[PDB]
């Protein structure tokens, strides 16, 4: 109800490159507890919106995950994409930096001269990431169960026991991933979670970078990531089917769901 933004969704509206809202962005001038940041925001969402912090993979920078920023922002979210202090930071450090990025978004929401002054509902936050940034996002969810949603891609962690996660979590993995293979990372992670709404979606033919900037499946991946965040960060039941369904797309090679009603 009170958190619903924008028009009733359709498959076509969610598959398109952009949602209904106009997006601006800026570079964070003095990043506090992480390497660098870009904030993407809707100028005209018609109310406060939730915030999402996105962390790249091992060896990687904002470039790898930046497509998410405009894609989510255009549907009604403030999105911070980060660089980590070092490209070689591990999951534990990525989680800390991720939460520091959300904390800085909260500072900017309270700063009259900021472009996102008063645009964020600080009680509604989400976490995303690729690779070790995905591992880090699930760590964030374990330590901060009031986070509304997690959406991760080809997650990597040195352990797969995420039974601690009570946050609604969508896991993308990439069929042909040799670095964080579905069978030893994403799927055991998925299976460990007993306490939440969850979905597992394998993208056909995909390398480890199959959900990164420039990927050929942004219609499907974007639709799913946006629908998940809309259903869970906004309690927007107009998105329940888009969030919880298994798409019959020939680009989907596996789909598993629990505790997710259509």
Which residues of the chain form contacts with K ion (CB under 5 A)? 23, 25, 29-30, 70
Is residue 74 among the annotated active site residues?
A: no
Consult the annotation and say whether 130 binds a ligand: no
H or E element in which residue 220 lies = helix 218-233
Separation of alpha carbons 141 and 130, rounded Å: 15
Complex with K ion: residue 66 or 208, whichever CB lies closer: 66
Query: 181: Cβ–Cβ under 8 A, 6 or more apart, which residues?
Result: none
Both structure tokens of 113: 């001269």
Candidate list 74, 96, 131, 209, residue with the active-site label? 131
CB 49 within 8 A of CB 5: yes
- Smallest gap from residue 32 Cβ to K ion (A): 7
CB 211 within 8 A of CB 172: yes
- Smallest gap from residue 238 Cβ to K ion (A): 25
CB 98 within 8 A of CB 142: no
Is residue 208 among the annotated active site residues?
A: yes
Complex with K ion: residue 70 or 115, whichever CB lies closer: 70
CA distances from 228 to 24, 85, 161, 197 (A): 22, 29, 23, 10
Taking alpha carbons only, the member of 48, 41, 44, 47 closest to residue 20 is: 44
Consult the annotation and say whether 58 binds a ligand: yes
Is residue 3 among the annotated active site residues?
A: no
- Smallest gap from residue 230 Cβ to K ion (A): 20
How many other C-beta atoms are found inside a 10 Å radius of the C-beta of residue 146?
Answer: 10
Candidate list 64, 137, 140, 208, residue with the active-site label? 208
CB 40 within 8 A of CB 79: yes
Strand partners, 63: none
Candidate list 83, 89, 121, 177, residue with the active-site label? 177
Complex with K ion: residue 68 or 242, whichever CB lies closer: 68
Query: 248: Cβ–Cβ under 8 A, 6 or more apart, which residues?
Result: none
Separation of alpha carbons 50 and 148, rounded Å: 9
CA distances from 62 to 33, 39, 137, 147, 166 (A): 16, 11, 15, 22, 27
- Smallest gap from residue 28 Cβ to K ion (A): 5
Complex with K ion: residue 25 or 249, whichever CB lies closer: 25
Consult the annotation and say whether 156 binds a ligand: yes
- Smallest gap from residue 40 Cβ to K ion (A): 6
Complex with K ion: residue 32 or 237, whichever CB lies closer: 32
Known binding positions for poly(ethylene terephthalate): 58, 132, 156
Active site residues: 131, 177, 208
């Amino acid at each position: 109800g009170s958190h619903m933004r924008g028009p009733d969704p359709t498959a076509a509206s969610l598959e398109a490159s952009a949602g209904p809202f106009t997006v601006r962005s800026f570079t964070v001038s003095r990043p506090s507890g992480y390497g660098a940041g870009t904030v993407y925001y809707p100028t005209n969402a018609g109310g406060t919106v939730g915030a999402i912090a996105i962390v790249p993979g091992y060896t990687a920078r904002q470039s790898s995950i930046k497509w998410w920023g405009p894609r989510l922002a255009s549907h009604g979210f403030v999105v911070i994409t980060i660089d980590t202090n070092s490209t070689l930071d591990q999951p534990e450090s990525r989680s800390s930096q991720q939460m520091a990025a959300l904390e800085q978004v909260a500072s900017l929401n309270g700063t009259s001269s900021s472009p996102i002054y008063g645009k964020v509902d600080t009680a509604r936050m989400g976490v995303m990431g690729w690779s070790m940034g995905g591992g880090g996002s699930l760590i964030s969810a374990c330590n901060n169960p009031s986070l509304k949603a997690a959406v991760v891609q080809a997650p990597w962690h040195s352990s797969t026991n995420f039974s601690c996660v009570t946050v609604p979590t969508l896991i993308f993995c990439c069929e042909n991933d040799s670095i964080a293979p579905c069978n030893s990372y994403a799927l055991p992670i998925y299976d460990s979670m007993s306490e939440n709404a969850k979905q597992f979606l394998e993208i056909c033919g995909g390398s480890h970078s199959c959900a990164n900037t420039g990927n050929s499946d942004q219609a499907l991946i974007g639709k799913k990531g946006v629908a998940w965040m809309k259903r869970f960060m906004d309690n927007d039941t107009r998105y329940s089917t888009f969030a919880c369904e298994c798409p019959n797309s020939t680009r989907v090679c596996d789909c598993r769901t629990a505790n997710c009603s259509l």
